[PDB]
C-alpha cells in the first residue's frame, strides 16, 4: 500500500526534523543566556542525549517486540518524544520558564533531554522495520525501494530542520525556533494515529526472546533458527562498528574543515543583522543525498538489478565503505592543501558568532570529498538498514534494528574517543584545538588519512565477514 508507506515516510520526516532541530543548536542554547551553562557542560549534555538515543534503541526494539507491538510502541514513543520536546519551548520562553525553573535550569532540561532521547531511540528502532513491513509482502526489492525512500525522507527532514529550524533558532528566536520541532513531533504523532487505520501491524511475540534467552530438543526449529540467525548477524554488526566510528568522525571533522574554508557569505539572509548557522555546514551531506537517492532508485538500482551486480546488501555496504574511505582520502588531500594555504593567507569569517580563521580556499572544494561520502550513504547506510531488516529474525526485527543503531552509537562513541586520543600531546594531531579553537595548527590531514586507513582495514575485515556470512 502507498498510504501506509507514505504515512511512515512523513512521520519519519517529522521525527528527523524535530531531532535535528534539537541537536543542531542545543549546545549554543544552553551556553547562551539565561541558561549560562559552562563551556563543556552543554557539550556533555548533548553527548549524554545522543548516547541515550543510541543506548535505548535495543530496549526500544525489545519493548515493541515483546510487550507493546511495533505499531503501539511508536505511538507511545512519539508521545514521550512530544512530552520531552515541550520542555524546550517552555524553557526558552521567559513567560513559561518560571513553571519549569548542570546549571540553574538543569532538572527540566535534563528531563526533556532524557525523554527526547528515549523517544528518538524507540522511534528509530521501531519505525524503520515497521515501515519495511508495509511492503515486505511485495518482496525484497520493494523493501529495498522503501529503504531508499526512507533514507530520502530522513535526509529531507534533516534538510528542513538544519535549514529552517536552525536558522530560526539562531537568527530569529529560540521560542519559535524550538516550537516548530514540537509541532513536528505532534504532526508525526497525528500522522501515525491517522495512518493506524491503514498500517499493517504484526502482533507482538513476548516469548520470542525467552527462547533466545534460554540458549528434537526442547525448542522448535524456528525458535532455534532465530538464535542461529542472531549469532550470525552479531558479527556483521560488530564489523560495522569501525565504519560507524569513521563515518561519525567524518560528520564532525568535515564540518570543522568547512568552518576553516572560505565559506561564501550571503549578503541578503546571512548578512550583518543575522548569522550564518553552523548547521548549514552540516547540511551539505543531506543536500547531496536528497539528489543522490532518487538517482539511485530510478537509475542506478534498476541497472544494477538488470545486470545482476551487487544483489546482496553486504556487498553494497562494502562498496559504501570503500566510497567513504575514498572520501576520507579526498578530505585528507584537501586538508593538506588547506594547511599549506593557511600559512600566508588567513581570512576571518563569522559562523554563528564565532570568528573562524579560514584559508583562501573555496568551501566548494569539499564537493569531491562530500559527493563520495554521499555515495557512501547511498550504499553503506541504506543497505545497512536492509541488512538490519532482512537478516533479522522475523520475531525480533525491531530488537535487531535497535541493536544495529546501538552499535552505530558504540561506533560514534569509539570515534569520539579516537578523536580524543589523537588530541593528546604525545600525538598532537588535533591537540591545538582548545588553546585557540582553530584547526589551522591541527594536523587534520593526518587524522583524515588515519580515518581512511581505519576504513580500509574495516572494509577488508567486512569483506571477509560478508564472505563468511553468505558462505
Amino acid at each position: 500500500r502507498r498510504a501506509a508507506c507514505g504515512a511512515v515516510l512523513l512521520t519519519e520526516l517529522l521525527e528527523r526534523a524535530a531531532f535535528y532541530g534539537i541537536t543542531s543548536n542545543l549546545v549554543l542554547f544552553l551556553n547562551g543566556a539565561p541558561f549560562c551553562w559552562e563551556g563543556a557542560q552543554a557539550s556533555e549534555a548533548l553527548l549524554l542525549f545522543m548516547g541515550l538515543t543510541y543506548l535505548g534503541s535495543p530496549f526500544g526494539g525489545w519493548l515493541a517486540d515483546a510487550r507493546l507491538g511495533r505499531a503501539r510502541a511508536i505511538l507511545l514513543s512519539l508521545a514521550l518524544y512530544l512530552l520531552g520536546m515541550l520542555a524546550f519551548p517552555l524553557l526558552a520562553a521567559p513567560a513559561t520558564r518560571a513553571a519549569l525553573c548542570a546549571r540553574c535550569c538543569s532538572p527540566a532540561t535534563f528531563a526533556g533531554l532524557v525523554l527526547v532521547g528515549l523517544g528518538v531511540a524507540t522511534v528509530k528502532a521501531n519505525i524503520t522495520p515497521f515501515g519495511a513491513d508495509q511492503v515486505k509482502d511485495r518482496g525484497p526489492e520493494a523493501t529495498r525501494r522503501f529503504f531508499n525512500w526512507f533514507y530520502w525522507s530522513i535526509n529531507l527532514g534533516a534538510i528542513l530542520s538544519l535549514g529552517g529550524i536552525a536558522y530560526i533558532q539562531q537568527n530569529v528566536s529560540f521560542v519559535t525556533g524550538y516550537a516548530i520541532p514540537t509541532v513536528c513531533v505532534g504532526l508525526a504523532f497525528v500522522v501515525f494515529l491517522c495512518g493506524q487505520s491503514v498500517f499493517i501491524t504484526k502482533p507482538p511475540d513476548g516469548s520470542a526472546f525467552t527462547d533466545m534467552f534460554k540458549i528434537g530438543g526442547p525448542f522448535t526449529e524456528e525458535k532455534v533458527e532465530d538464535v542461529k540467525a542472531l549469532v550470525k548477524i552479531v558479527p556483521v554488526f560488530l564489523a560495522l562498528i569501525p565504519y560507524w566510528t569513521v563515518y561519525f568522525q567524518m560528520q564532525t571533522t568535515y564540518v570543522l574543515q568547512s568552518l576553516h574554508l572560505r565559506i561564501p557569505e550571503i549578503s541578503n539572509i546571512t548578512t550583518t543583522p543575522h548569522t550564518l548557522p553552523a548547521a548549514w555546514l552540516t547540511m551539505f551531506d543531506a543536500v547531496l543525498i536528497l539528489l543522490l537517492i532518487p538517482l539511485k532508485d530510478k537509475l542506478v538500482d534498476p541497472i544494477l538489478r538488470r545486470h545482476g551486480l551487487l544483489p546482496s546488501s553486504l556487498k553494497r555496504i562494502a562498496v559504501g565503505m570503500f566510497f567513504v574511505m575514498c572520501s576520507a582520502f579526498a578530505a585528507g588531500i584537501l586538508e593538506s592543501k588547506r594547511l599549506n594555504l593557511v600559512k600566508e593567507k588567513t581570512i576571518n569569517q563569522t559562523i554563528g558568532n564565532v570568528v573562524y580563521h579560514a584559508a583562501d580556499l573555496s568551501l566548494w572544494w569539499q564537493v569531491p570529498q562530500y559527493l563520495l561520502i554521499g555515495i557512501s550513504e547511498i550504499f553503506a547506510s541504506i543497505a545497512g538498514l536492509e541488512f538490519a531488516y532482512s537478516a533479522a529474525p522475523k520475531s525480533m526485527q525491531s530488537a535487531i534494528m535497535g541493536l544495529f543503531f546501538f552499535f552505530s552509537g558504540v561506533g560514534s562513541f569509539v570515534g569520539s574517543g579516537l578523536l580524543a586520543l589523537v588530541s593528546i600531546k604525545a600525538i598532537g594531531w588535533m591537540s591545538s584545538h582548545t588553546d585557540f579553537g582553530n584547526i589551522n595548527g591541527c594536523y587534520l590531514n593526518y587524522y583524515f588519512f588515519l580515518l581512511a586507513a581505519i576504513q580500509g582495514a574495516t572494509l577488508l575485515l567486512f569483506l571477509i565477514i560478508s564472505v563468511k556470512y553468505d558462505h
Epitope: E344, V354, V355
Partner: antibody, heavy 121, light 107 residues
C-alpha cells in the same frame, strides 16, 4: 620590533588624489592583514578597509567605497591607501593598523598600529 | 554595520578608584570585542582582546567582561597612566566598528 612607519602630515588640496603610505617592517609583510583606520579630531575611530599583502584582496568598508583604494607594494613592503577627491570632511588621522591573526593564532586584534598620518585638506 | 555604542563619552575618575567603561553592541557580537587604549597623542594600543582576555603588558588591573550585546572594561586600580580614550571594537562582522570612545578624566 614590528614597525608600521607613517609619514605624518599629508597636507593636500581638495579634489586631488592622496596616497597615504605605511612602511611595514620588522615582520613578514605578506601574512597579516593591513587595515586602515580613520580618526576624526572630534569623533571616534572608523575602520576603512583591509588589504592582505599577498593577494591584495581588499575588504573595503562600504561607507568608504569609491573614496578609499587599498593597494600594496610588496617589493618595498609598503601598504598604500588612496583617497580620490578628498573633500573637507576627509581630513583626519589615518592609522595603518596591522591585524594580529594568522596560521594557528586566533589573536584577532589590531596588534601594531602606525603613528597616524594627519591628512589635512 | 554593528553600531557599537559607548553611551558615556567622558568618565571622571580619581587615582586609586575604579571606573567601568561600558559598550553596548547593536547585535549579538559574542566574545568578539577588543578594547584599545589611545593615550593622548598616540596610536591606540590593544588592551583586551576577546572582551575578556588581557594583552601582554597590561598591568592586570584593567579587566574585561561581557558577551553578546553588552561589554565592560573595568579598571579597579586607576593610576595616572590610565588617562586615555578607550575604544570598543567589534570584529564579529564586517565592517569593523569602533565605539564612540571613552576618555578617563583623572581628577
Amino acid at each position: 620590533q614590528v614597525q608600521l612607519q607613517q609619514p605624518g602630515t599629508e597636507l593636500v588640496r581638495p579634489g586631488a588624489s592622496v596616497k597615504l603610505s605605511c612602511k611595514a617592517s620588522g615582520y613578514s609583510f605578506t601574512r597579516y592583514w593591513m587595515n586602515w583606520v580613520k580618526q576624526r579630531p572630534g569623533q571616534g575611530l572608523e575602520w576603512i578597509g583591509m588589504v592582505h599583502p599577498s593577494d591584495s584582496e581588499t575588504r573595503l568598508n562600504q561607507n568608504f567605497k569609491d573614496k578609499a583604494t587599498l593597494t600594496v607594494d610588496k617589493s618595498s613592503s609598503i601598504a598604500y591607501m588612496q583617497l580620490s577627491s578628498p573633500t573637507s570632511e576627509d581630513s583626519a588621522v589615518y592609522y595603518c593598523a596591522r591585524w594580529g591573526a594568522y596560521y594557528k593564532y586566533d589573536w584577532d586584534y589590531f596588534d601594531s598600529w602606525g603613528q597616524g598620518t594627519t591628512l589635512t585638506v | 554595520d554593528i553600531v557599537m555604542t559607548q553611551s558615556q563619552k567622558f568618565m571622571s575618575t580619581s587615582v586609586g578608584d575604579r571606573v567601568s567603561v561600558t559598550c553596548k553592541a547593536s547585535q549579538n557580537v559574542g566574545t568578539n570585542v577588543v578594547w584599545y587604549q589611545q593615550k593622548p597623542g598616540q596610536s591606540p594600543k590593544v588592551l583586551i582582546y576577546s572582551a575578556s582576555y588581557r594583552y601582554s603588558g597590561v598591568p592586570d588591573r584593567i579587566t574585561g567582561s561581557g558577551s553578546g550585546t553588552d561589554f565592560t572594561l573595568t579598571i579597579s586600580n586607576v593610576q595616572s597612566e590610565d588617562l586615555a580614550e578607550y575604544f570598543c571594537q567589534q570584529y564579529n562582522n564586517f565592517p569593523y566598528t569602533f565605539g564612540g570612545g571613552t576618555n578617563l578624566e583623572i581628577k
